[PDB]
């Protein structure tokens, strides 16, 4: 998932953009993936209970 | 870039560039080309 970023692969973001906006793109992707992982952990806790 | 004549805005000219090595420092180092702001890609990364 692109999560609202231009590309879903990290090395493209590094190779194409400058740090000032590459950081924004990376931040968006990181928050998206952190949210996905947190959702997985929460459902795992419910199922474990 | 060094063409003597440029077409009008409505009849804008379109040129095809392919199958060649492109060096973007030849135009960047020229002083007159001041307004060079680039979308979707950094101006520095163009060489890579």
Swiss-Prot record, chain A:
Domain of life: Viruses
Chain's role: Subunit of the fusion protein that is processed upon entry into the host cell. Mediates fusion of the virion and cellular membranes by functioning as a class I viral fusion protein. Contains a viral fusion peptide that is unmasked after S2 cleavage. This cleavage can occur at the cell membrane by host TMPRSS2 or during endocytosis by host CSTL. In either case, this triggers an extensive and irreversible conformational change that leads to fusion of the viral envelope with the cellular cytoplasmic membrane, releasing viral genomic RNA into the host cell cytoplasm.
Protein name in the entry: Spike protein S2'
UniProt source species: Severe acute respiratory syndrome coronavirus 2
Taxonomic placement: Viruses, Riboviria, Orthornavirae, Pisuviricota, Pisoniviricetes
Gene giving rise to this polypeptide: S
Swiss-Prot record, chain B:
Glycosylation sites: 2
Mutagenesis or variant effect for residue 5 to T: In strain: Omicron/BQ.1.1, Omicron/XBB.1.5, Omicron/EG.5.1
Function comment: Attaches the virion to the cell membrane by interacting with host receptor, initiating the infection. The major receptor is host ACE2. When S2/S2' has been cleaved, binding to the receptor triggers direct fusion at the cell membrane. When S2/S2' has not been cleaved, binding to the receptor results in internalization of the virus by endocytosis using host TFRC and GRM2 and leading to fusion of the virion membrane with the host endosomal membrane. Alternatively, may use NRP1/NRP2 and integrin as entry receptors.
Subunit text: Binds to host ACE2. RBD also interacts with the N-linked glycan on 'Asn-90' of ACE2. Cleavage of S generates a polybasic C-terminal sequence on S1 that binds to host Neuropilin-1 (NRP1) and Neuropilin-2 (NRP2) receptors. Interacts with host integrin alpha-5/beta-1 (ITGA5:ITGB1) and with ACE2 in complex with integrin alpha-5/beta-1 (ITGA5:ITGB1). May interact via cytoplasmic c-terminus with M protein. May interact (via N-terminus) with host bilirubin and biliverdin, thereby preventing antibody binding to the SARS-CoV-2 spike NTD via an allosteric mechanism.
Name of the protein in its database record: Spike protein S1
The encoding gene: S
Residues of the full protein shown: 342 to 389 of 1273
